[PDB]
Design goal:
The complex is a heterodimer of chains A (about 210) and B (about 220). Chain A has about 210 residues and is mainly beta. Chain A has two domains: about 110 residues, Immunoglobulin-like; about 100 residues, Sandwich (Immunoglobulin-like). Helix content of chain A is about 5%, strand content about 55%. Chain A is built from two helices and 18 strands. In chain A, a hairpin with a 2-residue loop joins strand 13 and strand 14. The N and C termini of chain A lie far apart (about 65 Å). Chain B folds into two domains: about 120 residues, Immunoglobulins (Immunoglobulin-like, Sandwich), CATH 2.60.40.10; about 100 residues, Immunoglobulin-like. In chain B, the strands form four sheets. In chain B, strands 2, 4, 5, 6, 9, 10 and 11 form a seven-stranded mixed beta sheet that branches. The chains are: A mainly beta (about 210), B mainly beta (about 220). Bound molecules: potassium ion. It is classed as immune system. The entry lists the keywords IgV and IgC type folds, antigen binding, ifnar1, interferon alpha receptor 1, immune system. It forms a dimeric assembly.
Chain lengths: ~210, ~220
């Protein structure tokens, strides 16, 4: 099976700049049967280039491909907002068609600290014997953030999960939601619930908290 | 226009069988290959194999030989993908794509297949109530926690879709129980909290569950 290795894995650039994606094959492939695809979050992939050099119907002039043998590259000259997405190379020379592992291309912008909010468990959920506490980090950049949960100052481990939105199409920021889940019994035996947030745009950790009852 | 219409989302337990379909139209079906492509959650694309309906010539990628059957019924321009016995790692989006000298030049929307020992369950929708600890000088954050449902997906709207500015609906997380949990939040002026009702509208089609939850400050 022909292994395709893309470079780089992630790419942060601003609109108007140039992106150059590379893809190396484990053996020589005819340039006639090489392709690049684009996939935006929640959508099917779309063909960009075939024959390494030929633009698919409706694909802008700023995208261009080249290469032969084992080395192939895709270049996007004057980056636009719609170009910011995941890219995959592909060979279809072999009967066994293979793809590179992908390159995620995201928008680079001014560092922005998250706005942090904390949510106690609802009366509805507590009645069912469980207590979920949610922490929200809103509209921040870059994507790298760190959430720590604390119950009466004890660091919580293995009882929380988080997820992060796709880069926002308007402000190019991310948001993160983290849920700490404890039983009702444990929730009502502790008082101070704190979400401690660290991020490049913060000079020191931000801690939002509430006290059960108050 | 070249169209590729795929069958609806599927949910199965391990060991069970499954057939999904891909109907091509707007081109001569028997002149082109059809490819099946797997995309596991948060992962890349993998070719599973190709079929030429006109001849029923088939080549599988070495990895999928024996695990799946690709077939086609050329008279009704439909291609199929079959498993005798599903396992958890068959959970993915499955795309069909027309294949020719231009590679994979047209793609279907994709069929979601979820495989788990968990059983279909609708969500509990809890309010994420706005308060002093969820306001940042003028701006307030509120939301809904859509908890303990299976399988994906759920959709969330606010005030029957009249509110879209500043809404963030986060990707679900898969809990240790095998049930998903999702949060959806919106940021609003804190002055509007007293003068408006905020309702999240949650639909989980797989369980036929619709829920509208008012999120009031307290
Ligand atoms: K079976």
């Amino acid at each position: 099976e022909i292994v395709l290795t893309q470079s780089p894995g992630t790419l942060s650039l601003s609109p108007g700049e140039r992106a150059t994606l590379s893809c190396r094959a484990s053996q020589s492939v005819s340039s006639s049967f090489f392709a690049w695809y684009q996939q935006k979050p929640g959508q099917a992939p779309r063909l960009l280039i075939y024959g390494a050099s030929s633009r698919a119907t409706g694909i802008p002039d700023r995208l261009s491909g080249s290469g032969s043998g084992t080395d192939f590259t895709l270049t996007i000259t004057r980056l636009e907002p719609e170009d910011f997405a995941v890219y995959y190379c592909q060979q279809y020379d072999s009967s066994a068609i293979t793809f590179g592992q992908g390159t995620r291309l995201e928008i680079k912008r001014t560092v922005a600290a998250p706005s942090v909010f904390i949510f106690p468990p609802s009366d509805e959920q507590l009645k069912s014997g469980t207590a979920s506490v949610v922490c929200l980090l809103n509209n921040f950049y870059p994507r790298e953030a760190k959430v720590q949960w604390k119950v009466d100052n004890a660091l919580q481990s293995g009882n929380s999960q988080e997820s992060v939105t796709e880069q926002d199409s308007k402000d190019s920021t991310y948001s993160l939601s983290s849920t700490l889940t404890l039983s009702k019994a444990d929730y009502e035996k502790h008082k101070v619930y704190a979400c401690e947030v660290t991020h490049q745009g913060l000079s020191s950790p931000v801690t939002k908290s509430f006290n059960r009852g108050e | 226009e070249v169209q590729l219409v795929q069958s609806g989302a599927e949910v199965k337990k391990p060991g069970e069988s499954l057939k999904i379909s891909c109907k091509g139209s707007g081109y001569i079906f028997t002149n082109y290959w059809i490819a099946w492509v797997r995309q596991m959650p948060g992962k890349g694309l993998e070719s599973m194999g190709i079929i030429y309906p006109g001849d029923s010539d088939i080549r599988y990628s070495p990895s999928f030989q024996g695990q799946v059957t690709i077939s086609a019924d050329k008279s009704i321009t439909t291609a199929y993908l079959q498993w005798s016995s599903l396992k958890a790692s068959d959970t993915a989006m499955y795309y069909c794509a027309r294949h020719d000298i231009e590679g994979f030049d047209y793609w279907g929307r994709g069929t979601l297949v979820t495989v788990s020992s968990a059983s279909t369950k609708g969500p509990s929708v809890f309010p994420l109530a706005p308060s002093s600890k969820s306001t940042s000088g003028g701006t307030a954050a509120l939301g809904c926690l859509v908890k303990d449902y299976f399988p994906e997906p759920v959709t969330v709207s606010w005030n029957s879709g009249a509110l879209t500015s500043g809404v963030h609906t986060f990707p679900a997380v898969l809990q240790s129980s095998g049930l998903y949990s999702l949060s959806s939040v919106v940021t609003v002026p804190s002055s509007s909290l007293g003068t408006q009702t905020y309702i999240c509208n949650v639909n989980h089609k797989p369980s036929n569950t619709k829920v509208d939850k008012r999120v009031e400050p307290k």
